[model samples]
Target: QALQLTSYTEDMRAQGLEPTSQLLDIGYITADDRLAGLLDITAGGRVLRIERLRMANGEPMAIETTHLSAKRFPALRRSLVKYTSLYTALAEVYDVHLAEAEETIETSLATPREAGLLGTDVGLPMLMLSRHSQDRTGQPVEWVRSVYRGDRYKFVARLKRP
Candidate 1:
């Protein structure tokens, strides 16, 4: 039913597409009130921010910005440089198990920066999604925001009758 936790790399591979990411930026940032609330950390807490361009078959597909509590994974920045997928690094290095996530999607228009990154025209329709993921212990692990090229992407969901 597509309910299992899956990464973009795995999803693309299953569809016979090669997935890759280009690290746009990565650094530490102080969590603001909103971010602190999402990560369940105190305001001004240290957080690791990773910005990447998600691609499939060498074509840019999405821009993703992810935030994680630095205190939870102190060495994550170093590990991230060696791995293409964050989920892989998390599982292999930290033994973290992501059990569940809640994601919300919305229609948006590409901004100038987004258009430049995705190679699309400004104001083009985009699919913007935000996800909050929790580890096996139900502790907030990450908060991610992504913008996908609407013309090139589609989302599928399997609905079941209750």
Candidate 2:
């Protein structure tokens, strides 16, 4: 299986990347309030927070959303979390390991907003990945929403049915 953030790295790491990151705001988003409801939280509740980070390897290969449950990771500083993958923090710093996850693959044209985030033009093709993951007991822990440049990413899936 492919590791999470398998596609993300600092600016210096993408083969020819010089390794640098532009620290964006650690703001809050309530625009996806319906998402809050799905998580059994009040509207306008700080259910989730994400930082849009620009990663440059060679020259801005990708943009990523590093999402966290505001309620669970309240003690975390955005500065600390931004340094590496969240799961790495959950495992190495917090001692948590994910058991299993469900992922859905999708394709969509980037809207003006998405295009702006990815430094691409509107109507450009983009890859969409949505994931829901939980601990060993199936209690939900992480929910991810991401979009990648269509020309830059490919999903590799192998299927076996019982």
Candidate 3:
């Protein structure tokens, strides 16, 4: 996760990326089944959910919705917005120390709402990436689900053969 996040922040800089992000929503909500499994729950566990749309160079790139541990980062819930990067806020304001993250990637057809956000056909192919981030103590901090437009995004993975 650390390496991936570095890529996210650094690669953008390398590309001279003109990127925009909007924090669509931030509020306390009940955890869904998948979310519940990764997080500790009590009284249904209030989730600080943040919905965002990502665009690069004025083109739709990815639509992401992140669920954070409200119990962990209350300050983040108040400050994060459309113009700020979560990673920046996580490190600067919250003084968060990120240790690692687990990510899952797969392909899925864009749903109606996802298509509208990506400005593509409803059935267009999308690359879905879900991430679970943790702190040094192994406590989960966030769960993010993102869908990238297959037309505009490319995946480059490095592998070793031994």
Candidate 4:
């Protein structure tokens, strides 16, 4: 259900899926005070949010909402390319270099709003991921929260056998 923007298409095909997406929303908005505090950004500062409905063979797969430092990527609101990768746009157009990111996956009940976007019944189980990402210089650059249909999505991890 997730890939760094540039590799989404390739990765989806690797899993035998026909990748497609609808940009549900993209715009600049003030960061939530609580959210900004976690990212070390000032409360009420501008943030860019991109929301998408991801599909595979036209079936709803996941709903993703990503937030970034508006001060850092000013043109992001208008530079989006339909059906293109957001990470690619950040790299090629804005010169953003991703360095490291922390991710945690958990189980949660879908909210009514989320259920609507994901086309599922409210209170259904969902797989949630919260990611905090940084740039090459260790500057916090992005914070993302994504949810996938618990009944339909599977996450595979290749663990190192020590």
Instruction: Tell me the TM-score of model 4.
Output: 0.84
Using lDDT, rank the candidates from best to worst.
1, 4, 3, 2
Lowest-sum lDDT 10-residue window in model 2: 3-12
Error of 1 at 136 (Å): 0.7
What lDDT tens digits, residue by residue, belong to model 2 across residues 1-162? 444433345322544545445545565555267666444455665644555545545344345555456666665555465546566767665566777767777888876766776788867788787776766665566666767677766565455655
lDDT of 2: 0.59
lDDT of 1 by residue, 1-162 (tens): 336566677767766778888899999999999999999999999999999999988898999999999988999999987775798899999999788998787989888998999999976899998989999988999999999998887665556765
Candidate 3 residue spans exceeding 4 A from truth: 1-4, 11-17, 81-83
lDDT per residue, candidate 4, 85-148, as tens digits? 7777878887777777877789898888888877899767898978788778788877888888
Best candidate, lDDT: 1
lDDT of 3 at 94: 70
Clashing pairs in 2: 11-19, 12-17, 12-18, 12-19
Residue 27 Cα positional deviation in candidate 1, in Å, after optimal superposition: 0.4
> Deviation in angstroms for 55 in model 4?
0.9
- lDDT pick, better of 1 and 3: 1
lDDT for each candidate structure:
0.88, 0.59, 0.75, 0.78
Evaluated against the true structure, the overall lDDT of model 1 is: 0.88
Candidate 2 wrong stretches, greater than 4 Å: 1-23, 30-33, 37-44, 54-57, 78-83
Instruction: Order candidates by TM-score, high to low.
Output: 1, 4, 3, 2
